[PDB]
Amino acid sequence: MKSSIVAKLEALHERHEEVQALLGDAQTIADQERFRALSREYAQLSDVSRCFTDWQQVQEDIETAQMMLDDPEMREMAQDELREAKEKSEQLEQQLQVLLLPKDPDDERNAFLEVRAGTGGDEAALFAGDLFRMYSRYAEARRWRVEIMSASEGEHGGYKEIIAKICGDGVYGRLKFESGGHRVQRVPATESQGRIHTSACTVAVMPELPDAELPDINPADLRIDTFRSSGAGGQHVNTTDSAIRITHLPTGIVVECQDERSQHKNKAKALSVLGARIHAAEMAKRQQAEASTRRNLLGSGDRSDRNRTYNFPQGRVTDHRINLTLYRLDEVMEGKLDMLIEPIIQEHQADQLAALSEQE
RNA sequence: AGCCAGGAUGUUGGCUUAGAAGCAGCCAUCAUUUAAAGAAAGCGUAAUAGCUCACUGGUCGAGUCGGCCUGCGCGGAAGA
RNA sequence: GCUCAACGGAUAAAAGGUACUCCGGGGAUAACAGGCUGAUACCGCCCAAGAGUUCAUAUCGACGGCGGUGUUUGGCACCUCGAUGUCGGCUCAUCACAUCCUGGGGCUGAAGUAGGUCCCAAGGGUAUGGCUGUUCGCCAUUUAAAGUGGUACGCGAGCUG
RNA sequence: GAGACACGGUCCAGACUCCUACGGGAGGCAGCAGUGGGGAAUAUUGCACAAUGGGCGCAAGCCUGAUGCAGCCAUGCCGCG
RNA sequence: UACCCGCAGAAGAAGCACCGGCUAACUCCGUGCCAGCAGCCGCGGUAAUACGGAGGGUGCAAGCGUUAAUCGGAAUUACUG
RNA sequence: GUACGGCCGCAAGGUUAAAACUCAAAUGAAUUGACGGGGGCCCGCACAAGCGGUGGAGCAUGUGGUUUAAUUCGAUGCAACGCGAAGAACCUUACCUGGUCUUGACAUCCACGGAAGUUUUCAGAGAUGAGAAUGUGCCUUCGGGAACCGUGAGACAGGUGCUGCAUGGCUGUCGUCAGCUCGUGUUGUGAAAUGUUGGGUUAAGUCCCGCAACGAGCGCAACCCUUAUCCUUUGUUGCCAGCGGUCCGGCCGGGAACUCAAAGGAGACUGCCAGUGAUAAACUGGAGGAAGGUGGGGAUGACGUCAAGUCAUCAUGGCCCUUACGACCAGGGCUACACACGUGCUACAAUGGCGCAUACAAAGAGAAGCGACCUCGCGAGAGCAAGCGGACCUCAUAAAGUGCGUCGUAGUCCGGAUUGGAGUCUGCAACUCGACUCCAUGAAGUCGGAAUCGCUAGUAAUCGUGGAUCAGAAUGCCACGGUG
RNA sequence: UUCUUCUAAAAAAAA
RNA sequence: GCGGGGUUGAGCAGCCUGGUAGCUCGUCGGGCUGAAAACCCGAAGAUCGUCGGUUCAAAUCCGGCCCCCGCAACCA
């Protein structure tokens, strides 16, 4: 919302002033660690605050211009000044958008988009198909490639769950805000009595994490131990050690092998099992982390968990995280997501700056 | 080889950095005062800075420096 | 006229078990232990890209290189098959230093306390229990410390089974 | 002791609190206020024996946190503004 | 002390719950199955007399609502029944 | 009727018998509908018997999807898909990109200055910026009076923006199916029932009889339009039976009979007869009659159903924009194209193609219009040009048919798609994106899978003609006749 | 002779 | 160490004596149903695990390799 963003920018301006004063004080540089972050804070804050201050002057200029138009018969000059002011206001807002554009390297990474049906059943499945088409057309518009990793089709059409990988530039940055539940208010195709039914769908956007690497076991890291094997076998089994226990000291994993009579074969088998166990532990840790992140991002599937609502009879799209209602639903359905995505990016960056200001 | 003095300049070279000045790092590494002085070899700072220093002059006034073909030696060299 | 193919062809005609075994031999030939060697094992050293905010060498050290010991698993079959008893435990030890503690010292990314690493030094000391036949290992609680090894992986004409 | 197996009487054992010269002692608010604690929650460490009543005394009189009052609380009932 | 007489001045003295039906008392604006209400039936999903605020109204009044607990309604342990 | 506990049993288990938690209901009988792969009776191209198609091919048109700056919006089972659109070059146009305006393109009111009106001039794609000639139609205490412009301020205008799930009006649909109700009375505590059911009958809840029902209303039939027969009035621009003439042409004197043109009337009502039937309603058959039981066709659509369709015909409550979601102009888009579907046109051929000769229509339209005749062009058409506001003149010679000739089962003398060259007409302007003509070119197609549609008589099938829309632009739509 | 299934939001009056 | 295997998206035939790729389920487009299944019609698909070698020609033949499935890894 415009009022909310202007309010945040004002608070940032106050923060910027406080940072300049704190920098001037020299107590922070004595601290050193405090000054370094504060100086970065100032760097990011100064450009946006300067732009905002200029915008503030422009808004004041518009108020005075309207007043000038009403009384001294200076209406013609005021109308031109006001018109110029409007042009300036629009240009400053585009500049603000540029200043608040995300600079994070992580944002550029490609992403996996999973759309799953929630409440509504086949209806929700159809909406999932609509959402997938929406995002696909948006990706196509911005020159991205969509690969359908997995698909589970609905009975009456649509997809019960479709997982796709989108590869491009700035995919994660552009699409991170879509995650969460999405509510669709419409008259279902499956319906025969013309009733309107509120249904919900859960979307998860996950960034493509760096490719898994299996590090080769380091000899110094391993602590091989040779000991006598248990069981039958006579003099040879008693004198020859024939059993190897390798403990990986960083991960604290112990593998014991006494199968073959040869120590070399026992050691080889133990090394293989140890490598598999480390690879399994890493893989499991990744799955647990991936599952937890997905679990948090995805909603419960109920109508209550929402981040966007699409009302089809009245053609209205509403964003719940930051207030914004748009009476469209056709342009947005046919790609053109930028109008919705951008205010969220700008607000998120402002929130991030505020969080950075508050970190101690 | 010691001793004494210097080793300034444009400019804090250009970047990017929250700072980058010789030093986190990427490219040049030019030019002047010309008895020489380095877009600087490092220490060092939180960056500058400060110190040693690549090079220039008196001093004592006889050799000095590191490569080649070779003989013989030193360390590397710890067990019941 | 024979895939008599085990191809100078034992017959035209034939598979297994022995820990219930047994005889004649071989250390001509294996398992234990000893011997030679050292691939493998363990411990060092040479060059220094890099980790260490800057800085290779405080501490580590990639890609590669050269050794020492006999020390794990081996390679060979030189000793023994007209008998060289073998894993672990108990009792009793003795030696080496590549030192676990105490002693002396250099550097430290050593403020102090407490540490890291290396050099010198074997005079003395170097746990008790739970689990398993266990060596090894994990765990509980101490200790200045709970060393690594050699001695037929010491020791059954001393004990166990 | 007429009446107790006796709240402010005796003895023993147990838990707790306090004094100690370490040998040994003292105590029991479920009396009136009152303090920590528990709980959603419940009051003042007040005045007087002037009246009623109890104990002693021949009586005057003394004692009575019983009792009569006062302080806090809209806790309830009733009346008025 | 109760009580009585005189002095100045309308000053020093009104709040709580509810209004879709049960249940007496209705409209407007913000929000769009969100925030929320609720003792039961049940409201709210961008025209809410049911949420929140305002105006108006209804019931009580130094009190007003909510909660806990018992009986009634419950002839829903019935002897009456 | 489960867990735990007790008792019984060889076991399966039996018997006695809770609690926590959860919901504001669970249940019984009966009533009105709806449904049954329940029963009985009846109807409709619903099935059966046939004819011709669609799905296969090319093209026209509409939709979904996709592409795009936009491919404008709406409809989407029957009841959307040759649908709104009864006609997209600009216009329409609501969409896109640019160039422009802010009391405005379109209304009312106020103030000021000009009558309006008229031709030209440069810049710009144009929208609108600049520039010269003209004038006065109204009354007169003639500071004024009507329109029609320009400037300023406002109240206001403006919206094909959203909500048909807030609506009016209008329409589809079950379905022209025969049903849907009410007043009073009665039965049941009551929702309800009866009437409206039953026996016959009908196309029909049409009619009769019976009957706790008696009546009434909206509907199912009739009254309305058209067609079929006859009579009276009227005979021109319509007709020619009898005559007189003819350039042989109803053409000209004429004639009012006939076709035909309208106006009025007659006629078809189970009216008559026989049989069946309940002495009824009614049904079957024939006599006359052009027509027999509703003679054929149409208009006519009950209470209601689908929150069906339309806020984009219009009107309208509320929400949204007011230097723009309003307004003007040029150019583009609605005509895009890997694909899928709906409705058609032309075909795959001999019941035919081509060439010549020849016969018979109906119903319409026409003044910014239909346009004879003659001349030119192979042709679409062009020039001159009478007649006609139309029973007169024009569109306009109907085609299939018939007679003759050729083709001889072939991707063909079938079929015309596609493409190149040259033109005509409309319109400021045929590139995207019109219709038609000439020459050349001659794809697929040899009767079509699963499936599916229309039709019971002048119907299906087939062949042409006209009209609305319209400056031009139909294979669609609405009518008309020929064979059948 | 066989012939299964259709989730999840509606609104209806008060002499 | 030894036998067998790798074939359209999945499970599997046939690799035959080296010139030649098949089935079921699945997939795509129509049809039925008001709609989704089931059903009907018409289609499509592979560099036969990897790399060298002998042929005119290798999925087939040879050799090496990777993965999968069995068998064995015993006397001390």
Side-chain angles (χ1 to χ4, degrees):
Chain A
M1 196 61 205
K2 182 266 290 181
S3 297
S4 314
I5 195 165
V6 172
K8 281 181 186 179
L9 292 167
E10 282 175 352
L12 285 183
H13 182 223
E14 289 181 354
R15 182 60 185 178
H16 159 263
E17 289 168 300
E18 279 177 355
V19 173
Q20 77 184 358
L22 268 164
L23 269 187
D25 289 330
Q27 310 306 299
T28 57
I29 202 176
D31 312 330
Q32 193 40 249
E33 294 293 323
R34 182 185 172 92
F35 150 80
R36 263 186 63 200
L38 193 70
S39 60
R40 298 193 283 270
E41 281 171 62
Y42 196 84
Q44 302 136 22
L45 278 175
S46 181
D47 297 329
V48 59
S49 283
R50 191 268 299 164
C51 176
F52 187 52
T53 316
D54 296 353
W55 177 88
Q56 263 181 336
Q57 302 318 291
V58 168
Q59 73 88 27
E60 294 150 33
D61 201 3
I62 290 172
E63 65 86 19
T64 69
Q66 80 85 21
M67 292 293 308
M68 273 184 68
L69 186 152
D70 315 318
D71 285 332
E73 199 265 332
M74 290 181 153
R75 177 160 317 170
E76 300 292 323
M77 187 177 288
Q79 82 96 26
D80 314 327
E81 182 193 358
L82 176 70
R83 187 222 308 115
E84 278 169 351
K86 287 193 292 200
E87 309 149 11
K88 281 191 287 285
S89 177
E90 268 84 56
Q91 284 295 317
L92 279 70
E93 277 171 352
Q94 278 90 39
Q95 294 165 44
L96 279 168
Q97 189 184 2
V98 169
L99 289 158
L100 294 164
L101 271 175
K103 65 175 77 63
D104 189 359
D106 290 330
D107 278 16
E108 181 74 21
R109 284 184 299 162
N110 317 326
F112 278 85
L113 183 148
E114 317 158 346
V115 297
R116 308 179 148 85
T119 195
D122 280 278
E123 176 58 30
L126 288 156
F127 186 46
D130 305 330
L131 275 187
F132 174 63
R133 179 184 176 263
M134 197 156 92
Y135 301 152
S136 75
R137 289 174 51 94
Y138 191 57
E140 184 69 32
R142 312 187 55 105
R143 297 310 299 264
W144 297 346
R145 189 183 69 235
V146 177
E147 307 204 339
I148 309 186
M149 310 313 270
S150 178
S152 287
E153 284 86 36
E155 291 92 352
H156 290 101
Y159 294 113
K160 302 170 69 179
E161 51 174 7
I162 170 167
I163 303 167
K165 189 195 188 181
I166 299 171
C167 301
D169 291 330
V171 169
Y172 191 46
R174 276 285 166 192
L175 306 179
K176 57 198 182 153
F177 311 110
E178 278 80 6
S179 67
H182 293 276
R183 179 165 91 183
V184 54
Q185 309 182 338
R186 75 182 287 166
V187 173
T190 57
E191 187 53 48
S192 87
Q193 301 287 334
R195 291 180 302 149
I196 309 169
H197 269 276
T198 286
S199 61
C201 294
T202 50
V203 161
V205 182
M206 295 192 63
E208 184 184 42
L209 299 164
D211 208 289
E213 197 267 333
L214 191 156
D216 171 55
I217 57 174
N218 215 13
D221 290 355
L222 301 172
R223 189 181 64 87
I224 298 99
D225 303 290
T226 80
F227 51 104
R228 289 159 168 88
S229 57
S230 60
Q235 299 202 94
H236 190 259
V237 76
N238 294 317
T239 59
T240 68
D241 285 329
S242 71
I244 295 304
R245 150 193 308 124
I246 313 168
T247 70
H248 202 215
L249 304 167
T251 66
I253 302 181
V254 185
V255 170
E256 182 184 356
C257 182
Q258 328 187 334
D259 297 282
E260 285 315 295
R261 307 190 174 185
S262 175
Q263 167 167 349
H264 312 300
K265 299 170 164 291
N266 291 323
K267 190 175 167 160
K269 202 190 278 192
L271 285 174
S272 67
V273 173
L274 189 43
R277 280 192 195 169
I278 289 156
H279 186 70
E282 287 293 323
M283 269 292 110
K285 197 256 183 182
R286 277 168 197 125
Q287 292 330 102
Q288 285 301 101
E290 194 204 355
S292 78
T293 50
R294 185 179 293 113
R295 209 172 285 113
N296 294 327
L297 284 170
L298 286 170
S300 69
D302 203 28
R303 295 154 284 266
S304 66
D305 214 340
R306 264 169 283 142
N307 272 336
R308 275 172 196 180
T309 301
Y310 306 82
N311 192 19
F312 281 79
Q314 305 177 5
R316 168 185 79 250
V317 185
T318 63
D319 186 11
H320 308 287
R321 279 175 285 117
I322 80 167
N323 272 298
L324 210 61
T325 71
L326 282 71
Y327 279 96
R328 289 169 181 172
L329 205 41
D330 56 356
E331 292 99 9
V332 184
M333 267 301 285
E334 297 176 3
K336 304 289 184 66
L337 282 167
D338 280 303
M339 43 201 68
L340 278 190
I341 296 178
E342 282 158 354
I344 317 175
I345 307 175
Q346 212 180 7
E347 197 87 20
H348 178 237
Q349 285 302 131
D351 284 315
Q352 271 180 332
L353 284 183
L356 203 45
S357 76
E358 281 173 349
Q359 76 92 27
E360 185 71 33

